[PDB]
Fold Nitric oxide synthase, inducible.
Amino acid sequence: QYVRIKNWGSGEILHDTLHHKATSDFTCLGSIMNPKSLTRGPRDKPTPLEELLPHAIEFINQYYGSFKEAKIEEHLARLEAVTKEIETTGTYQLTLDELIFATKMAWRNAPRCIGRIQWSNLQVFDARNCSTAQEMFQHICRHILYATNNGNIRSAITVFPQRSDGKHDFRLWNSQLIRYAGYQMPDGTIRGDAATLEFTQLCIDLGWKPRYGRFDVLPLVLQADGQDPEVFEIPPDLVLEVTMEHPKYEWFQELGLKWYALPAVANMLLEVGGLEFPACPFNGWYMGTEIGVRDFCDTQRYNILEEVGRRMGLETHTLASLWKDRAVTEINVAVLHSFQKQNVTIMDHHTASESFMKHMQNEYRARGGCPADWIWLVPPVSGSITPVFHQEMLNYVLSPFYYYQIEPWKTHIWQN
Amino acid sequence: QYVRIKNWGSGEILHDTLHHKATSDFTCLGSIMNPKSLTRGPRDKPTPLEELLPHAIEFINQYYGSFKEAKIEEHLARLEAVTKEIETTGTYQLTLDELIFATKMAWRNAPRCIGRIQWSNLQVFDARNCSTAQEMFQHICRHILYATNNGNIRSAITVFPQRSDGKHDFRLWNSQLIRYAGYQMPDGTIRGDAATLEFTQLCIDLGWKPRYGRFDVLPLVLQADGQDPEVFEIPPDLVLEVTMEHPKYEWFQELGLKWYALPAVANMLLEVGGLEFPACPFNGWYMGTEIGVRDFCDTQRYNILEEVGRRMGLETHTLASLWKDRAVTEINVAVLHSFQKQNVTIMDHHTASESFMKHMQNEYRARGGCPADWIWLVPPVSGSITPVFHQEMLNYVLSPFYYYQIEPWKTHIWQN
Ligand code: HEM
Ligand code: HEM
Ligand SMILES: CCOC(=O)N1CCC(Nc2cc(C)ccn2)CC1
Ligand SMILES: CCOC(=O)N1CCC(Nc2cc(C)ccn2)CC1
Ligand SMILES: C[C@H](O)[C@H](O)[C@H]1CNc2nc(N)[nH]c(=O)c2N1
Ligand SMILES: C[C@H](O)[C@H](O)[C@H]1CNc2nc(N)[nH]c(=O)c2N1
Ligand SMILES: [Zn+2]
């Protein structure tokens, strides 16, 4: 009937019934980063009608089933219209309102997202009429400008044309809209973001000119209508960055660190009512730890931990001194302080965690559940200090949903 | 053939084949604290021979199969001897060496234990001849004394009589050998460990005299041969405690905090070759965060976070200031500093994490796998700063294994 869920801090009990609406096979492989169950791969043929129609009906029912006061007539009319469109065209087009509803629901259904309390606040850019890479670039620039909003970050998503036969997919090869390059220097050292070494080389191979800087914004690698990807530099005027300063340590700015203000996932696929949108970049605003802990402290990223430790005069040669804990916290403080001082939206991980708890509470009350991946929801630092750490959660895949995809360079058939 | 596992920090890839030897049904319910798959409940009848014999053979094969130079003759002889013992008695007795091997393997197979690099270093106390509660108490006192070793903590396990028909189970009702009481005071405030309020009341109901202190060591509630549980106060001379001091903040000792040196799990069940040992308390040494973060900072425990924040002069009314991160770290420092100064064994979470990574590496090389529960292995603070956070892991149940049990007070049939 339902799965019992407990919060080991408050003792509160919740009953999950929403998981019954979960889809296909899932994964215990809970700590796997990219499992097949969260990935929706490529196709070389259209979606079978016997599969598409049932999913379409289900979605249309969910949509009309979300209104406070039902519109029975339109409901049946839409069901009929969709069926006919599927029989006569082999697929169907969502109405703008249906699409907007789908993007918000997919967000609402993202298990790894801690900011879902904001799920109903999302700007949707309809680019389903897009046809060329140049046009893709223009839509993306518009999105970046709208979302950045001079520091007052706004959540948005741009929806490109849905997959047809799988041979004309629109795809952004970048993992994020804004990301820094990584270079293997002559002296053997790595400059910039070490995690983007390969993609940076790809951009260079495609004609992009390397600048060999520590923070060079990568170009957009856009694939339109299944054609070979084209490279487009992002106009620097559209990239807002925050220079890192510490409220007490004057020497922190000496590190010469900075980061972009816009966190945007560029390579996921939106699944809705049987349809698949391979290109749908979206953004929210940053949670401090993403930059302060992952970008700056991951060893395979900018890895500034030891340097900050020395500057603080800590015993960086004695793990037990907990110098790493002291350093990472001052870095997190620098990040929050800098974004705040420069009037750029950002939320600390404690506030975000409490924010998600309220949302989870609202969700179980509203629809009896909230798909959640504990492993991704607990912040990278101060785990049990946040309420989410003590909350049991159920992870499942609903629909609409945002899926991972197989890296395009691994499946793309080049024209030349 | 094998499951691919990746470390997102080093990029290293591992192949898991050991999971094939996993047992019954498991649980995505990865973040559930006490799932049925990790629990081995009570019985009212002996283990069916058709089930017991196969498990017994399997274990005996594993045992003789662990020697560098095989002893084929003894192997077959033991297999024969066990079968005959099962046919003639309905069960069988493990040899001392088999038991020792079983306890270490169960530890080796504990997915939620970060200290498994020490798996082969374990003292085993054979109390399978035990018959009364008083004798249980004596064995437990011997264990506590041996393990504490004046501060130089030694890992040990005491094995009581195996389950026969399920009506004569030996059980320690306590969750841990050493734990502090919790009291609901007249003015409505809670004194001591809030998480033990119920168990404390149980002890009081059984005759134990409450002292109403902040750190009153709870008595042992021992069930022998299926009889009603008897209460035994632990001789104070056997309980080593560490008074909490901070290396810089003189005011920290003013908090009047202390904690016990011995971390001992008292209520789990050891499963081996078809046999079940409902009473087998074991101990290792503490990892700093258990006390510094969970005991002292969990809101439903001693909850000292805010008080420490004020004393540090932090902005405890502004979450974004990250005052909680600063406070918890100084508390962790106090814990490590105090244990060290008082010459009591303890390991910080960074060293422990690296320790486990080395172990995991050894395990995949030695037997192609290492059952691991990421959710329990990543420390409660500084998650991604530790290497374990970036390591994909596979969680499965092997045999021998340490299982949870249904709380005894929920299934016990009182004589009076
Ligand atoms: C409003 C502010 C928002 C905040 C603060 C927030 C925060 C986060 C954080 C911290 C992560 C973890 C990223 C990582 O560790 O790589 C995440 C993941 C995710 N977010 Fe949100 N989010 C917000 C808005 C959005 C929006 C607008 C959408 C979609 C419409 C969304 C969709 C997702 C998805 C699908 C993931 C998983 C990404 C992956 O698996 O790599 N988020 N979010
Ligand atoms: C040598 C030092 C050891 C260290 C530092 C270590 C550390 C830990 C830690 C930190 C936990 C988490 C406890 C919690 O969060 O409640 C744990 C759990 C566990 N440990 Fe170890 N351990 C050690 C020795 C042992 C020994 C000797 C055994 C058994 C023979 C063992 C069996 C387990 C088991 C079964 C669990 C899971 C307990 C549960 O699920 O509640 N450990 N250990
Ligand atoms: C390692 C580079 O990481 C990133 O560029 N990002 C980190 C991962 C991802 N974060 C996000 C995404 C969203 C949509 C909202 C808040 N935070 C996008 C930005
Ligand atoms: C909340 C009370 O917690 C405890 O008494 N403990 C915390 C949980 C458990 N920790 C352990 C157990 C072992 C065997 C080794 C190291 N650490 C036993 C001690
Ligand atoms: C192996 C493990 O799945 C990996 O390190 C995880 C842990 N939790 C995470 N949580 C978030 N939010 N983002 C991440 O990239 C990761 N990576
Ligand atoms: C809900 C969740 O399972 C619970 O809070 C967990 C998280 N990780 C843990 N990890 C350890 N080591 N010990 C714990 O008690 C817990 N509790
Ligand atoms: Zn699972």
